Amino acid sequence: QTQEYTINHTGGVLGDSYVTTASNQTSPQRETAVLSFECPRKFEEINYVGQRDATRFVPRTTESITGSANDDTVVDLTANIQPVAGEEVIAEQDYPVAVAYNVTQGVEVDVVDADYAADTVTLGTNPADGDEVKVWPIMSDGDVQFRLINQFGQEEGRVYPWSTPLYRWHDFPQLKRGREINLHGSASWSENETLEILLDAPQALTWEDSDYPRGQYVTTLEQDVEITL
Amino acid sequence: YAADTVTLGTNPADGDEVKVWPIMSDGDVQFRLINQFGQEEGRVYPWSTPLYRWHDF
Amino acid sequence: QTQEYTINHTGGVLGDSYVTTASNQTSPQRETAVLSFECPRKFEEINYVGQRDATRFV
Amino acid sequence: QTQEYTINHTGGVLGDSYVTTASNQTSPQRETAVLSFECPRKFEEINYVGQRDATRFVPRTTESITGSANDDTVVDLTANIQPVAGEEVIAEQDYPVAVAYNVTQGVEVDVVDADYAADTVTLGTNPADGDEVKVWPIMSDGDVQFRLINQFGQEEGRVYPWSTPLYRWHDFPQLKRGREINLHGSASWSENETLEILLDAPQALTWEDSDYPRGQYVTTLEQDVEITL
Amino acid sequence: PEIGNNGAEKQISLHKGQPFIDTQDVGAADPNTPAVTIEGPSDYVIAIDAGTPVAPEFRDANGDKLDPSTRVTIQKCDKQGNPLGDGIVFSDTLGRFEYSKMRSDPDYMRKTTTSLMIDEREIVKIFVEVPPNANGMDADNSRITIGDDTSDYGKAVGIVEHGDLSPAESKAVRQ
Amino acid sequence: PEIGNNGAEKQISLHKGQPFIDTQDVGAADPNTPAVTIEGPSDYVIAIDAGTPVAPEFRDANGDKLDPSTRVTIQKCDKQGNPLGDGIVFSDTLGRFEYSKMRSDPDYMRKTTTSLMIDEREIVKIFVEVPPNANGMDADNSRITIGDDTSDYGKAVGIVEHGDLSPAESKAVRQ
Amino acid sequence: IGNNGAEKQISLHKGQPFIDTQDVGAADPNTPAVTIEGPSDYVIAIDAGTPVAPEFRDANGDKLDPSTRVTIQKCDKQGNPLGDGIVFSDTLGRFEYSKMRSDPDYMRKTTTSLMIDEREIVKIFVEVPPNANGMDADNSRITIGDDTSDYGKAVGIVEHG
């Protein structure tokens, strides 16, 4: 009867219809709904348990600059920054804190290091004047949470009262049992009822850019759940 | 009162600035409680009542 | 002990501080919070009952 | 075994090492530590009792002016002012509310009177233009208190919760039994443990100036204690 | 180290620089406002005896004393800034203190009239009546003090933590 | 929808971005102040067990770690910023954490020494002792964390609403 | 507050009253680099599995010759050493000062138990080979016991009274 699956921000067991993504909002700090999963017709019910079900959620943002004659090799940012689980070094991390891509030169761009104290990052390359650039740094200073919807956009409850910060979420090394993250709360729902994963943070996150090298979908969520067939 | 229309009794002049504060419609109102933190615990009544009806009675 | 008062979008028994107003939003249809009342320091508690307490909102 | 001694802001039974003085801070109003006494090696323990042990603490401040051609004969101040236990008259006080000294003319300077309402004081002499001056008026608008330290800069408790104002401290005529001051609290400590006497007030007090006529050390503390040999 | 377990009924005094007190400036012919507001902190109980000293030392903005025909009135209140006639104490004139020796001298030391108590959430106000065509009060230089710690003369304000004693609630209801 | 009636003793953790916590910068040779202040919210009760993890991760303004001879001391206080000797926990040095793996690793995970409790209105302070001729603390980059949610290792901070349980007052008096 | 037990747990270091240090040159075994004394009416206890951690340095801010030797040693009153009761006769090398206190693996413990009556002494002798740089007390540090940690131990203290 019961199984233990993973569910992702796209498709998976659902089929890309009863998922929906969305960005947050910047100027009004508000508890937006960045993702939501609706239980399809075919399942009987879905469960969700804390301290039983593992999780992963790698968000990012997007920013841009303008090429100049001066040898920049460094860019400021609008988002608080830190390393992935802490380290000054690049390529030792579980994943890159930041990625950069040049529109003109359709190539990746490495990263040397950064201050990780102020909103700063180094670039290893020397961008030319007029060249367009994009960057997908780490995100910080946010809160994440869950809530349930009974088919109508009509809340009935909340999985767990207190929000967990995405900041801390990046801080812990993920994907290690014993050190794996496990939120609290014990939810369950049935056909056409929705779980919404909600965000409260200033910086504008992303889901799709169509010019990001390390995979198509920039960010990701991967959550464990229990299903009754 | 069928389409989004209203009459004025006066004859405004050209260039004159005007303001109007008509009735509102097509909305929902509801309640919720907050425990000092911006942190909801519950909801007074699940189903919203429409302000439309609110004006009607 | 108990009384039956009215409370308004300004001042009243509260004092214009622990009220706050706000407008809605237009382009994203969202359940905004147009008004809110915070129980002040001095009271003990507030109650609210349906089919007991009247109302007006223009 | 037990005795009843006095202890002072310098030397005394201790030996000038296990005392330490310090000034306060002005811009951040903070509970500084102006004095502290560490129980030496040789004693067994020290006690301290309220309504048993008398006390005295005469603080002051320092300010300066600039000579001018105009016949000043009066100076404003940055500190609230009142007479010593109240009186309009000078030389009747238990001690002078204020002292002044001219750098050029290395002489004392008398005082006539003052308003004692605003930050004001009169000078009896007629300072010349360009002459440098110093003044050590009374201090006001402060709080004093006690706390104990267990050899480490690590507090364990507080003698008495509520601070007493130095303002009132000046107001009462000192050194009169029945009218003598006697704080509350019953403290006791042992070898190398410290009692800190703390100050919370804006104006910058002093301990040493090297050009003050009425003694070397400007301010003073004189507290009664009980000692076990 | 050793400290004595001092009794819960601690002997204290009130002044400007505290959290549960506040003040604000006053003009002229202006009774209704508290120049100074006091409030009971949480889970504490304050007690002011009848022979408690009192000491307002108000000032003018220019640093002067005001018209001694001015009046001061301490007054207990129910919650919500709601005054009450009974329980009022210290209806005095602003003159006839001699601020120089006021607290200093037990003679000049003006005491209250009757007892008083402050339950955990209650208010005590200090209204002031200045005659017109006079100068206003300045909060920077004004001050209140009540109670006499640190002197064999005078009394002191009692305080106790409400959570310690069991009949603290009984005394609170007793008022 | 269905949600489980989770127990009142909720498992939580503390960090900078909360309402009942605060911080402020620190200079050098500067013990007396709390670099970080914590306070009990209203009608809640916090509980910190003896095997609770601890994790200060202070920084310098330029984005560096400070002199490891620096000392950190968590300390309970009575009301009014009044510290107390008993009940102190976590008198540690600022060095010897390895912030990279500190929370991450149960080895590096430095726990407290003894139990602790916070009644509804109480204070816990975090004093810091920096040697002179050193750089100061910068609140923008500093941080505290205590408790270990979200891991089979470590413990978590207990919380409970005071109004739910009847012996909540009994445990509060028990301290 | 919960009444803490008299057997309190502490850790030792330089900035304390009942400890002292003094500079050392070269080939100077008799001179104690560091001295410890029992305070009045207290009793200190150091178990056998107690961590140890010296961090001696050179005046220029460098580590010394790891062939250097360190010896903790109990002493009778009057600065008088004893053969029995000695612990931690170790070398100055083989610590990895970077990971010394943090890693329990690189953490070094003592050999046997120890006790300090109210007026007693513990010294830390150092043997440096000649033609080497001397010790500088400004930069040196000592720590024994690991308070606030799961591994290691803590130095027990109790009031005699």
SS3 percent helix, strand, coil of chain A, rounded to 5, is 5, 35, 60
Residue F88 touches chain E, beta carbons under 8 Å = no
- Closest Cα in chain B, distance from residue F124 (Å): 21
Experimental technique for the deposited model: cryo-EM
Determine the Cα–Cα distance for residues A53 and A226; give it in Å rounded to an integer: 8
Residue F31 touches chain D, beta carbons under 8 Å = yes
For residue E169, give the DSSP letter: H
- Other Cβ atoms within 10 Å of F7 Cβ, number: 8
Determine the Cα–Cα distance for residues F89 and D71; give it in Å rounded to an integer: 63
Host H or E run for residue A19? strand A19-21
E–F CB contacts, 8 A cutoff, strictly below: 5
Determine the Cα–Cα distance for residues F174 and G6; give it in Å rounded to an integer: 20
Residue C30 touches chain E, beta carbons under 8 Å = no
Instruction: Indicate which of F67, F93, F171 best probes the interface with G, i.e. most G CBs within 10 Å of its own CB.
Output: F93
B–F CB contacts, 8 A cutoff, strictly below: 4
Residue C41 touches chain E, beta carbons under 8 Å = yes
Which of E118, E101, E158 lies closest to E37 in space, CA to CA? E118
Three-state SS at E142 = coil
Contacts of E162 (CB under 8 A, 6+ apart): E43, E44, E45, E120, E168, E169, E172
Which of F79, C45, D184, D185 lies closest to E41 in space, CA to CA? F79
Determine the Cα–Cα distance for residues E123 and F15; give it in Å rounded to an integer: 36
Chain B residue numbers touching C57 (CB-CB < 8 A): 29, 51, 54
Determine the Cα–Cα distance for residues E102 and E114; give it in Å rounded to an integer: 20
Of the CA atoms within 13 Å of residue G45, those in its CB half-sphere come to 11
Contact between chains at C57 and B45 (C-beta distance less than 8 A)? no
A160: nearest CA partner in chain B: B41
F127: nearest CA partner in chain D: D154
User: Scanning the structure block, which residue is given the tokens 């003040």?
Assistant: E23
Tell me, letter by letter, the H, E, C secondary structure of D44-108. CCEEEECCCCCEEEECEECEEEECCCCCCCEEECCCCCCCCCCCCCCCCCCCCCCCEEECCCCCE
User: Scanning the structure block, which residue is given the tokens 């108590």?
Assistant: E117
Which of G86, A145, F80 lies closest to E41 in space, CA to CA? F80
Three-state SS at F168 = helix
Contact between chains at C25 and A28 (C-beta distance less than 8 A)? yes
Chain B contact partners (≥3 CB pairs within 8 A): A, C, F
Domain ranges of chain A: 1-59+140-229, 60-139
Host H or E run for residue C21? strand C19-21
Rounded to 5 degrees, φ, ψ at D171 are -65, -45
- Closest Cα in chain C, distance from residue A153 (Å): 10
Contacts of D20 (CB under 8 A, 6+ apart): D35, D36
Q: Do chains G and B touch (3 or more CB pairs under 8 A)?
A: no
- Other Cβ atoms within 10 Å of D92 Cβ, number: 10
Chain E residue numbers touching F172 (CB-CB < 8 A): 163
Query: In the numeric block, which tokens belong to residue A99?
Result: 């990625």
Contact between chains at F1 and A172 (C-beta distance less than 8 A)? no
Contacts of F5 (CB under 8 A, 6+ apart): none
Q: What is the DSSP string of chain D?
A: -EEEEEEESSSTTT-SSSEEE----SSS---EEEEEEE--SS-S-EEEETTTS-EEEE-BB-EEEE--SS---EEE-SS----SSS-S-SSSSSS-S--EEESSS-SEE------SSSSEEE-SS-PPTT-EEEE--B--S-EEEEEEE-SSS-EEE-S-SSPEEHHHHHHS--S-TTTS-----EEEE-TT-EEEEEEE-SS-B-SB-S--SS-SBSSEEEEEEEEE-
Which of E118, E41, E13, E45 lies closest to D160 in space, CA to CA? E13
Residue G16 touches chain D, beta carbons under 8 Å = yes
B–C CB contacts, 8 A cutoff, strictly below: 7
A34: left (phi > 0), else alpha (psi -120 to 50), else beta?
alpha
What are the strands, taking DSSP E only, across chain F?
Answer: 2-3, 10-12, 21-23, 34-39, 44-48, 53-56, 71-78, 82-83, 89-93, 110-111, 116-118, 123-129, 144-146, 157-161
Determine the Cα–Cα distance for residues D105 and D110; give it in Å rounded to an integer: 13
Query: In the numeric block, which tokens belong to residue G109?
Result: 């413990």
Rounded to 5 degrees, φ, ψ at D167 are -50, -60
Contacts of A107 (CB under 8 A, 6+ apart): A101
| A151, A157 contact by CB (below 8 A) | no
| A229, A43 contact by CB (below 8 A) | yes
The CA-based angle F81-F86-F90, given to 5 degrees, is 85
Instruction: Indicate which of B54, B56, B57 best probes the interface with C, i.e. most C CBs within 10 Å of its own CB.
Output: B54
The CA-based angle G55-G58-G60, given to 5 degrees, is 130
List C-alpha distances in Å: A81 to A116, D196, E62, E81. 6, 43, 54, 49
Query: In the numeric block, which tokens belong to residue D198?
Result: 């703390």
Which of D148, D97, D146 lies closest to D123 in space, CA to CA? D97
Chain F contact partners (≥3 CB pairs within 8 A): A, B, D, E, G
Contact between chains at B37 and F19 (C-beta distance less than 8 A)? yes
Instruction: Indicate which of F121, F123, F175 best probes the interface with E, i.e. most E CBs within 10 Å of its own CB.
Output: F121
Instruction: Indicate which of A30, A154, A196 best probes the interface with C, i.e. most C CBs within 10 Å of its own CB.
Output: A30
Which residue from C31, C48, C57 is facing B54, i.e. has the nearest CB? C57
List C-alpha distances in Å: F8 to E97, F2, F13, G135. 58, 18, 15, 58
| G28, G140 contact by CB (below 8 A) | no
Determine the Cα–Cα distance for residues A4 and G74; give it in Å rounded to an integer: 62
Contacts of B21 (CB under 8 A, 6+ apart): none
Chain E contact partners (≥3 CB pairs within 8 A): C, D, F
User: Scanning the structure block, which residue is given the tokens 């005082």?
Assistant: D111
Q: Do chains G and A touch (3 or more CB pairs under 8 A)?
A: no
By CB atoms closer than 10 A (0-12, 13-18, 19+), residue F157 is: buried
Contacts of B9 (CB under 8 A, 6+ apart): none
Determine the Cα–Cα distance for residues G12 and D182; give it in Å rounded to an integer: 39
Contacts of G138 (CB under 8 A, 6+ apart): none
Determine the Cα–Cα distance for residues A163 and B6; give it in Å rounded to an integer: 49
Contact between chains at C25 and A25 (C-beta distance less than 8 A)? no
Chain C residue numbers touching A30 (CB-CB < 8 A): 30
Of the CA atoms within 13 Å of residue E107, those in its CB half-sphere come to 4
User: Scanning the structure block, which residue is given the tokens 């980059």?
Assistant: F141
- Other Cβ atoms within 10 Å of B21 Cβ, number: 5
- Closest Cα in chain D, distance from residue G154 (Å): 17
Determine the Cα–Cα distance for residues D208 and F58; give it in Å rounded to an integer: 38
Which of A45, A54, A39, A18 lies closest to A175 in space, CA to CA? A54
Contact between chains at G141 and F76 (C-beta distance less than 8 A)? no
Residue B44 touches chain C, beta carbons under 8 Å = yes
Long-range contacts of C41-50 (CB under 8 A, 24+ apart): C41/E121, C42/E79, C42/E80, C42/E81, C42/E121, C43/E79, C48/B44, C50/B45
For residue F31, give the DSSP letter: -
Which residue from B39, B40, B46 is facing A154, i.e. has the nearest CB? B46
Rounded to 5 degrees, φ, ψ at A210 are 65, 5
| A183, F151 contact by CB (below 8 A) | no
| F28, F131 contact by CB (below 8 A) | yes
- Closest Cα in chain G, distance from residue F4 (Å): 35
- Other Cβ atoms within 10 Å of D223 Cβ, number: 20
